[PDB]
């Protein structure tokens, strides 16, 4: 479950990367 | 405890993302 939270963080950071890019 | 440190890193990266965004 903690790792799934980390993967959600990964999705969020990818989303912000796409936004800024 | 290491995972909590990783989650603190997650909070920091989210904060910088909000700052730049």
Swiss-Prot record, chains A, B:
What tissues express this gene product?
Answer: Expressed in dorsal root and trigeminal ganglia. Specifically expressed in a subset of pain- and temperature-sensing neurons. Not expressed in heavily myelinated neurons. Not expressed in neurons expressing TRPA1 or TRPV1.
Task: Tell me the superkingdom of the source.
Answer: Eukaryota
Query: Post-translation: what modifications?
Result: N-glycosylation is not essential for but facilitates cell surface expression, multimerization, association with lipid rafts and ion channel activity.
Q: Per the record, what phenotype accompanies loss of this gene's function?
A: Trpm8-deficient mice have severe behavioral deficits in response to cold stimuli.
Where is this chain's protein located in or outside the cell? Cell membrane; Membrane raft
| Record's subunit section | Homotetramer. Interacts (via N-terminus and C-terminus domains) with TCAF1; the interaction stimulates TRPM8 channel activity. Interacts (via N-terminus and C-terminus domains) with TCAF2; the interaction inhibits TRPM8 channel activity.
Q: What does this protein do?
A: Non-selective ion channel permeable to monovalent and divalent cations, including Na(+), K(+), and Ca(2+), with higher permeability for Ca(2+). Activated by multiple factors, such as temperature, voltage, pressure, and changes in osmolality. Activated by cool temperatures (<23-28 degrees Celsius) and by chemical ligands evoking a sensation of coolness, such as menthol and icilin, therefore plays a central role in the detection of environmental cold temperatures.
Its UniProt domain note says:
Cooling agents bind within a pocket formed entirely by the S1-S4 helices that opens to the cytoplasm.
Family indicated by similarity: Belongs to the transient receptor (TC 1.A.4) family. LTrpC subfamily. TRPM8 sub-subfamily.
The protein's name: Transient receptor potential cation channel subfamily M member 8
């Amino acid at each position: 479950q903690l790792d799934s939270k980390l993967n959600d963080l990964k999705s969020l950071l990818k989303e912000i990367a796409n936004n800024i890019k």
